Design a protein around this ligand. Sequence first.
Ligand SMILES: O=C(O)CNC(=O)C(=O)O
Ligand SMILES: [Mg+2]
Ligand code: NI
Ligand SMILES: [Zn+2]
Length: 331
Amino acid sequence: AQNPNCNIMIFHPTKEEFNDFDKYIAYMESQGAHRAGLAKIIPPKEWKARETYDNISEILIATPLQQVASGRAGVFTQYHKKKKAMTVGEYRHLANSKKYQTPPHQNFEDLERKYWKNRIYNSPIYGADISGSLFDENTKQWNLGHLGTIQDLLEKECGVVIEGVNTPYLYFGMWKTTFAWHTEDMDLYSINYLHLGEPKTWYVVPPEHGQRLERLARELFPGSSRGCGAFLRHKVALISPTVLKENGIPFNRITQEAGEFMVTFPYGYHAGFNHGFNCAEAINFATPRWIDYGKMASQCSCGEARVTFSMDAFVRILQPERYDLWKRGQD
Ligand SMILES: O=C(O)CNC(=O)C(=O)O
Ligand SMILES: [Mg+2]
Ligand code: NI
Ligand SMILES: [Zn+2]
């Protein structure tokens, strides 16, 4: 078996290898990459997402989210308070203000120490889940607005035509903005490109060990667990690397820099934080190997997780027994 310790793998495709997206994903999996839950892909040196980022300031963040924490430094939840609309130029100025800017630090490890010590004492503002793309239409390779759709994959593998669409989303971050422990909707893959700015640190649990993370989360968030049988779908819970180590949970970490892609694999729990002002683009995708994960994915039926129009069809076709109860949650 390849990559039996489930380490995060880093790939450096040539421009020739960067032509065929599906083929490269299948290659990475042939080397065991999926066992980690997360891989990094450094694009060929000749490739670019677009010519410049000079003209993005007028993108609107219609509903910036203030991420307010509760709990202890290593075990906390966050709630998202809605704020008034602002442009990306206005958000960048806010991220760079004395109140929100990255503190002085020695290196990424020192900054990670400072994040886990101090995150709960601040409420950074995140622009999340903004439908759109920053890839130039002329970028033909690994353009996250031009991928094969999940509805087309399901149709190709299973023969069933379904409604729904698959588009990318933009993320504008600042120091301490946080993504909670989660897998993707329907345990899909994700791909994330860091277009510009400061890094993003990721933590990930190997898919084969995801249930260990779930059992710890039920112990650490016991009222949330009683409220919902898949409460990590709410995307609110954080657990630090120190707490994971104290409880024997297998995980890995890596820092993504501007210009780099990350891929998350089916049922790879992940969480992380931004180092300073940045912009990322991400989308879900599927492969043939995903189908069985989609059939087994947990679902939130308490009604908190509330997700896209296109997830309906996935549940209806892959999980017809759950359909009924999951849609009672979504209506
Ligand atoms: O970058 C972010 O805030 C969160 N993104 C992801 O969870 C992803 O790409 O799967
Ligand atoms: Mg603009
Ligand atoms: Ni994700
Ligand atoms: Zn729920």
